[PDB]
Structures are given as structure tokens and as C-alpha cells.
Structure 1
Amino acid sequence: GPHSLRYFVTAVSRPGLGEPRFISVGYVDNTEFVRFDSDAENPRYEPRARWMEQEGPEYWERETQKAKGNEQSFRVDLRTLLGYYNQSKGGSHTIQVISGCEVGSDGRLLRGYQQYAYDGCDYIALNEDLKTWTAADMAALITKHKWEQAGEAERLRAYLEGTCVEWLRRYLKNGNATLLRTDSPKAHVTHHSRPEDKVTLRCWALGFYPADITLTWQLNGEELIQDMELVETRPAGDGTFQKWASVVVPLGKEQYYTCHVYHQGLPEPLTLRWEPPP
């Protein structure tokens, strides 16, 4: 299947409280594998996935010094943006970035990313064409003309097509086993009596991984996606995820409904029903 190496960087100016909080987090296939944090004792890149300890003390040194270098630029950027947006030097602001590359099953590039956000609102982003930019507002335009001049679009196109990808292949090679891991869900149905003559049938899927999953309720073979209530997939805290979906059916017609659980870990979708204790 496809793969990807992206970095989620954040810099939060904390006027008064001290220097800006810088936090860089690298993800491979949506799985954190590295992280930096200035607001730490002696800021250094630490592995987040055991398989990263396969990297020598160079990588870390090299990668750490680069993190510190981006940190300072970000410290400057923040000052700059206060200029563009004419904002006081006594308020907290956020600069966020997503920088990465998504490859295909062949090791080629499918799409590279490079988008900024200020205070949680798209600022600038590289176009899929990897040559032109999409400035979100008047401010972003200034960076946009600067980067067109310097030829930033090219510098990144280079990184995205080579270095990025190259490193992606390198990371995968030592994490595939782990990244391809899969934990099937274990589902069950709970019963809850509602006001009047109704009842609620909540279908639970537990300890599944990855988070991706789908649950459905059917009335004699038909997906009741209209009156089905469901929560967003949430973390258990041990690596797995959870999720439930429920519907309100009439008291006595519980056996006319069945739950279906679709997860990539399963050999075949799940099918359950209300199971009153024998």
C-alpha cells in the first residue's frame, strides 16, 4: 500500500512567560516516530517508535541541530507575522506547518505537502503542481512574492521528490513490520431501556488498530444511517481505539436488528445482535 513521511511543526509565542514553545513531530504512515520540543530540559530529537533506535547518534545530532535551526527561524517568523498583521507584541500566536511526502506502492511520489497556518487558519500552501503557491490572505501574499523570487517552490520540489522520498524508503525499511501491524476489533452489543416503550442498542468495537473503522446497524438487511447515533473513534490509551454506534428500536423487536463491524484487521466483517444472557 501507499506510504508517507510528514512533519507536524508548531511554534507558540508565549509573550512574558518566556521564549516560544517549539514542537516538531514526524509521522510515517500517520504514526509518530520522532519528536522535538524546546520546552524540554535539553531539547533533542527523541524516537517515538522503537524501530527508530536503529539510527545512530549522528542522525539525532544532525536532526536535532536542524530542529533548533527551524526553531529560531520560527521565532523570527512569528515576529514577522506580527508585523504583517499589525498585532501587539504582548499576545500569544501560533505558527503551524505540515511538511511531507506521500508515495505510491512503487516508491515514487504521489503528492508532496508544504502548508502553513497562523493562529489556526491556512496561511500559504504549495500547489499540487509543486511550482506555485496559494496565499490565504494579504499577509501570505508577501511571503508568496518572496518565495516566488527566491524560488522556494523549486527547493521544495527538490526535497519532496528526493530527500523526502529517499528517507521515507529508509524509515519504512526498518518499520514496515511494525507499521503494518493490525489489531482486530472485538465487538458486543449492550442494552439500555429508554423512555416509553423504546430501547437502545449500542454496538461496541474495542481494542482495534489502526483507528480506521466502520460500524453499521441494519433493519432486516438495510443500513439505518439516519437515526443511528455514534461517537468519534477514540483512543483507549494503550495503543488501540474504540467506537460505538447505537440506534433506538421498539421494545420487543430487538432481534430484527443486527450490527456490522468493518475493520481491515478482520478476515471478514462482523455481524452481531442483542444477546440477552442465556
Structure 2
Amino acid sequence: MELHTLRYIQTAMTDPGPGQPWFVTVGYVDGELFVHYNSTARRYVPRTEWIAAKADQQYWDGQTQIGQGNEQIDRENLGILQRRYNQTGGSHTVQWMYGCDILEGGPIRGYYQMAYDGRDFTAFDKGTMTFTAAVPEAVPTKRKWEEESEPERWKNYLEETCVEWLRRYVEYGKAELGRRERPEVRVWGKEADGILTLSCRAHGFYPRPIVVSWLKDGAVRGQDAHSGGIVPNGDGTYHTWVTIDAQPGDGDKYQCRVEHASLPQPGLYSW
């Protein structure tokens, strides 16, 4: 089944750090970064080759207008929220995430959520056409938005607009999104204090999902198994590492197994 996602996330900070823009928006198609805006450049730029190639100038112009408008709004939001919370300066952040998921072309979800200082603030519930106030300070926002018919507006963005563009993007980048990049795998060992820690590292795979298991003479022994999760490289591919603690001299006993879309049969690796 063909599953695709479109996701925008937006960050407005009072304290982004030296040299850093205080406002940033980025968009993802199937988890892959493809557009970017920040308050420094003040325009939307492509982050994949396929969006840069298939989109025209009017697309970027119009999107840049959206980005600038969002910046001005969140500039104001930061001020409104700090006063509502009785906070003067220091460090505060607004976060937005919203988007849609399609399966076989049909929408299966649409979300629009906000957080303040790292905590849920509001979430759109599309089913009941209501906004949820997660904290007392969000109650006037809920009341304001539902008063101005924001539910209908976000219902049509999420069910029509978001979905339409997602279907467009997936066709633009069909070859790229469906690409396969095979990991290079290395098993390494380090003994310290009567404990041999065996490491298995998968380098540069795409797509993101992967299963890396430690097999102890054939059986999926995930007891000592510590996974570092899946982490990104700078080049659009991913990385993961999984360790297992063993007894000294028990190294040729363990096998690393890597299951990934680029590998027709699972890879087996050892020290």
C-alpha cells in the first residue's frame, strides 16, 4: 500500500542562539526535507532537486509570501503568549506542526497542533470541528478560533489543499522518494573491565526504516541490545548503531543482522 506524508513544522524563538534565525519553517515529504524558510533569508528555498526542478517561479514567490506572513504572525504570538503567562523576557518558544497523510491516494489523517515552551497548547480535532485547549492559558485561543470559523478553514486546508499538493509532490519526486541506498555495515568490538562491547553500525541507508539485530548463535538475543535509534547523515541518508555486551572471548559467537529495503536478503555481519 502506498503511504505518503506532508508535514510542516514551524519554530519561533525568543532565544535561538548567536547567529541563529529566531523564526524557521521547514516542510517534509515522506520524512524528507524539501522546503525551507527562515527570518534571515526571508524566502522559501528548495531543499531537494526534484522540487527545484518541477516548480516554477510563481510557486516560490507565493510560498515566500506565506512564509513572511507566518513570520509576522508568530512574532505577535510570542508577545501575546508571554503577556498571557505573565512572563517578561528569558527564553520562550512557539512550535507549530500540521500536515496530512495519504494512503492509496486517500487522506487518512490531518493534524494542526501548537505547543508553547515545549508543552501541548492547542490541537485541532477535525472530527468534532473543535479546537482542544491543553492548558488553561489556551482556553481564550480555543474560543477565539472557533468564533472566527477556523475549524472550517483548517478542515478544508487539511482535507483538500494539503492533500492535493501532497499528491503533486509525490509525483514530482517519485523516482527520488522511491530510491534505495544500501548501507555499509561494520561490526566493531571494545573490551573494558571484563566486558566486551560489540557494536554494529549501518552507514548510509535509505529509506529510513531499518532493523538491526544481534543474533547469539542464531537466536535473536536482544537482551543487552542497546540501539541508538535512527539518526541522519548530511546527505539525505541515515545511520544506526546497536551494541550488545558480551563476555571476553565470546566475539565469534555473535552475529549482526541487517534488514533493509535495499537488501533482498538480510545482511549478516560479524567481528
Where 1:133 maps in the other structure, the secondary structure is strand
How far 1:195 moved relative to its partner?
2.2
Q: Does 1:231 align with 2:228?
A: yes
Contact preservation (8 Å) 2:12, 2:22: yes
Structure with the higher strand share, 1 or 2: 2
Q: Which amino acid letter does the alignment assign opposite residue 164 of structure 1? A: C
Q: Give the 3 Å change call, closer, same or farther, for CA 13–250 of structure 1 in structure 2.
A: closer
Q: Give the 3 Å change call, closer, same or farther, for CA 158–219 of structure 1 in structure 2.
A: same
Q: Give the 3 Å change call, closer, same or farther, for CA 176–250 of structure 1 in structure 2.
A: same
Contact preservation (8 Å) 2:126, 2:151: no
Contact preservation (8 Å) 1:260, 1:271: yes
Contact preservation (8 Å) 1:130, 1:153: no
> What is the aligned partner in structure 1 of residue 40 from structure 2?
39
Contact preservation (8 Å) 1:13, 1:94: yes
How far 1:83 moved relative to its partner?
2.4
Aligned length: 267
Which one of the candidate residues 175, 178, 184 is aligned to 1:177?
175
> What is the aligned partner in structure 1 of residue 155 from structure 2?
157
> What is the aligned partner in structure 1 of residue 85 from structure 2?
85
Cα-to-partner distance string for 1:184-228 (whole Å, 9 max, x where unaligned): 2122322323323x4332222112123322211122232222212
Where 2:222 maps in the other structure, the secondary structure is coil
Cα-to-partner distance string for 1:134-172 (whole Å, 9 max, x where unaligned): 211111111111122222122111111111111111111
Structure 2 unaligned residues grouped into runs of 5+: none
Identity of aligned residues (%): 43
Where 1:226 maps in the other structure, the secondary structure is coil
Contact preservation (8 Å) 2:126, 2:155: no
* Distance in 2 between residues matched to 1:7 and 1:254, nearest whole Å: 45
Structure 1 unaligned residues grouped into runs of 5+: none
How far 1:270 moved relative to its partner?
1.5
More deviation, 73-82/246-255:
246-255
* Distance in 2 between residues matched to 1:228 and 1:128, nearest whole Å: 40
Where 2:181 maps in the other structure, the secondary structure is coil
How far 1:130 moved relative to its partner?
5.8
TM-score normalised to the size of structure 2? 0.91
* Distance in 2 between residues matched to 1:93 and 1:200, nearest whole Å: 41
Q: Does 1:65 align with 2:69?
A: no
Contact preservation (8 Å) 1:124, 1:133: yes
Q: Give the 3 Å change call, closer, same or farther, for CA 70–131 of structure 1 in structure 2.
A: same
> What is the aligned partner in structure 2 of residue 21 from structure 1?
22
* Distance in 1 between residues matched to 2:269 and 2:15, nearest whole Å: 51
Which one of the candidate residues 179, 187, 200 is aligned to 1:189?
187
More deviation, 116-125/76-85:
76-85
Where 2:28 maps in the other structure, the secondary structure is strand
* Distance in 2 between residues matched to 1:6 and 1:241, nearest whole Å: 19
Matches within 5 A, 1:265-276: 265-274=262-271
> What is the aligned partner in structure 2 of residue 50 from structure 1?
49
Q: Which amino acid letter does the alignment assign opposite residue 237 of structure 2? A: T
Q: Which amino acid letter does the alignment assign opposite residue 33 of structure 2? A: E
> What is the aligned partner in structure 2 of residue 139 from structure 1?
137
Poorly superposed stretches of 4+, deviation over 6 Å: none
Contact preservation (8 Å) 1:5, 1:28: yes
Contact preservation (8 Å) 1:182, 1:210: yes
> What is the aligned partner in structure 1 of residue 97 from structure 2?
98
More deviation, 116-125/232-241:
232-241
* Distance in 1 between residues matched to 2:249 and 2:34, nearest whole Å: 50
Q: Which amino acid letter does the alignment assign opposite residue 35 of structure 1? A: H
* Distance in 2 between residues matched to 1:39 and 1:188, nearest whole Å: 41
Which one of the candidate residues 123, 126, 131 is aligned to 2:124?
126
More deviation, 77-86/252-261:
252-261
How far 1:231 moved relative to its partner?
2.1
